[PDB]
Amino acid sequence: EAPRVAVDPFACPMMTMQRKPEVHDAFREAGPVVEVNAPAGGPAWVITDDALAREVLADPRFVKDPDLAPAAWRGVDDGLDIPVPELRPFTLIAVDGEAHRRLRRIHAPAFNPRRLAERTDRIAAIAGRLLTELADASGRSGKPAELIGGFAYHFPLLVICELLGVPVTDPAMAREAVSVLKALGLGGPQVPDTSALESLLLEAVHSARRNDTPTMTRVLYERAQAEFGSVSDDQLVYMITGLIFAGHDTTGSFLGFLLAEVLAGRLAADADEDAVSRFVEEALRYHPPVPYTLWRFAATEVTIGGVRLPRGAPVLVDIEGTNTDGRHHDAPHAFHPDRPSWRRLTFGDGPHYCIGEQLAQLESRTMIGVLRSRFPEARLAVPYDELRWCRKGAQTARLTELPVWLR
Ligand code: HEM
Ligand SMILES: COc1cccc2c1C(=O)c1c(O)c3c(c(O)c1C2=O)C[C@@](O)([C@@H](C)O)C[C@@H]3O[C@H]1C[C@H](N)[C@H](O)[C@H](C)O1
């Protein structure tokens, strides 16, 4: 049926900043829907057309249900996001239908952008502390500040933890713990001492239960309880565990790119607000951290751009590819903020759209304000052309490193 390209779509060599993997162009040229090799055995189909993928993502026949995935995938493609049956109703990514509408109704007031905005200053603070520290340390050592390990993940982590009421002192270690928690909770084997974080997560929940203070975590607790009749501490810890993982790991991947672009000098020195939000917009087009959508499966057989897809056909949208489509974007592998503001799929589409878009963009804009207002001379300590980025399977794209002189 479909044009077939016999490769892992997740394959990814060491990459330079300007290029995207060639698999992407292969798929596109082969057609709107392309059979490829899934990492964990068996076929998979990849969409390459913006318009098509958008319909697919609002099409109830394409579902998250991890139980439709191939048996060979279970306990071997940690790219498969498979909570145990009884937590799936608390996992946004693993449901559709009313279970999903419910979770969405639960998260939406918690992510109220009025209330995100009210904490701009707190977020600037976080950025600045981190940046000062890395600067102060760079002056001491004489070595450049490595912004990936140093900032890109610690910044969004602290932000998202703070909004939930989760007091973190060691961002490096909270990251390791929350990563493990995530792994276990999305189906994975078997000592990152998660108990530490768990303790703090449980504290936020506890705090949320007893205090009418409208935290993010309290709003969650209120909506869950009304929707579910009754919610448990372990349930609320579980959900927020997921917000922390997503809130830091995807964002941080992105921010490393955004930084590299800012520090390379590609944003004009006197950029208005709007010029900045244009630069961010473009970096989100040009450096999506998530290559393809999350695993979706055909719930029946379906025929989609003239191709006929079996029951349980593993389907992906190509985010990286669609965003770098010569056809819909003039000079797609060039970085042009002033581009005629067009659509992208970096945050996805349809009922499962990223609920963090606002936050991630807020974080992005604010970070650039801190940098140009307090670190005006911050510059790459190596050439942009020598930077390199990579991803191993289902992991977000990220730079190997980002050496910087912050002042
Ligand atoms: C640059 C940053 C981010 C990017 C690029 C990103 C990307 C995406 C994408 C593509 C989806 C949809 C997945 C699919 O349908 O296959 C998604 C969903 C989601 N995002 Fe993000 N995300 C980002 C930041 C954040 C942040 C900061 C948070 C939370 C604090 C967050 C939380 C979520 C959650 C909970 C979902 C699940 C949606 C659902 O299943 O209804 N994200 N994101
Ligand atoms: C215990 O964990 C959870 C409990 C309740 C809800 C969730 C989770 C969870 O871990 C969880 C995630 O990890 C992720 C998302 C997400 O929304 C949840 C939950 O909704 C959304 C994101 O995919 C992006 C796109 O924002 C980030 C992340 O998905 C992970 C694993 C996935 N294979 C892929 O590598 C992606 C880059 O990263």
Distance from C-alpha of 298 to C-alpha of 56, rounded to nearest angstrom: 10
What does the alpha-carbon distance between residue 198 and residue 206 come to, in Å, rounded to a whole number?
A: 12
Residue 93 CA to residue 81 CA, distance in Å, equals 8
Both structure tokens of 143: 């070595």
- Could you give the C-alpha distances from 347 to 30, 285, 343, 355, 360, in angstroms and in order? 25, 10, 11, 9, 10
Asked whether 250 lines ligand 2 (CB < 6 A), one says yes
What is the CB neighbour count within 10 angstroms for residue 75?
13
**3-state SS of 76-118?**
CCCCCCCCCCCCHHHCHHHCCCHHHHHHHHHHCCCCCHHHHHC
CA distance 44 to 377: 47
Q: Is 148 in the pocket of ligand 2 (CB under 6 A)?
A: no
Is-contact 299 313, C-beta < 8 A?
A: no
Q: Vertex 50, ends 47 and 55: CA angle to 5°? A: 80
Residue 325 phi, psi (nearest 5): -100, 95
Domains of the chain: 4-405 (1.10.630.10)
Task: For residues 261 and 334, give the distance between their C-alpha atoms in angstroms, rounded to a whole number.
Answer: 12
- For residue 164, give the 3-state DSSP assignment: helix
247 in contact with ligand 1, CB cutoff 6 A: yes
Question: Which tokens in the block code for residue 29?
Answer: 């040229």
Residue 225: CB partners within 8 Å, gap ≥ 6?
231
Decide if 147 contacts 134 (C-beta within 8 A): yes
Q: Locate the ligand 1 atom nearest the alpha carbon of residue 254 and give its number.
A: 1
What is the three-class DSSP state of 60? coil
Measured in angstroms, the resolution is 2.5
Give the contacts of 67 (CB within 8 A, at least 6 positions apart): 82
Cα separation, 61 vs 63, in Å, equals 6
The answer to whether the CB of 258 falls within 8 A of the CB of 280 is yes
Distance, in Å, from the CA atom of 275 to the CA atom of 17, rounded to the nearest integer, reads: 22
> What single-letter amino acid sits at 332?
P
Calculate the alpha carbon distances from 241 to 54, 121, 235 in Å.
Answer: 29, 24, 10
Q: How was this structure determined?
A: X-ray
- According to DSSP, the β-strands at 33-37 and 4-5 are parallel
Other Cβ atoms closer than 10 A to 253: 24
The CA distance from 365 to 283, in Å, is 12
* Ligand 1 mutation target, pool 104, 250, 368, most atoms within 8 A of CB: 250
Q: How far apart are CA 162 and CA 139, in angstroms?
A: 29
The answer to whether 164 and 157 are in contact (CB under 8 A) is no
Q: How far apart are CA 398 and CA 202, in angstroms?
A: 31
Say how many CA atoms lie within 13 Å of 379 toward its Cβ: 6
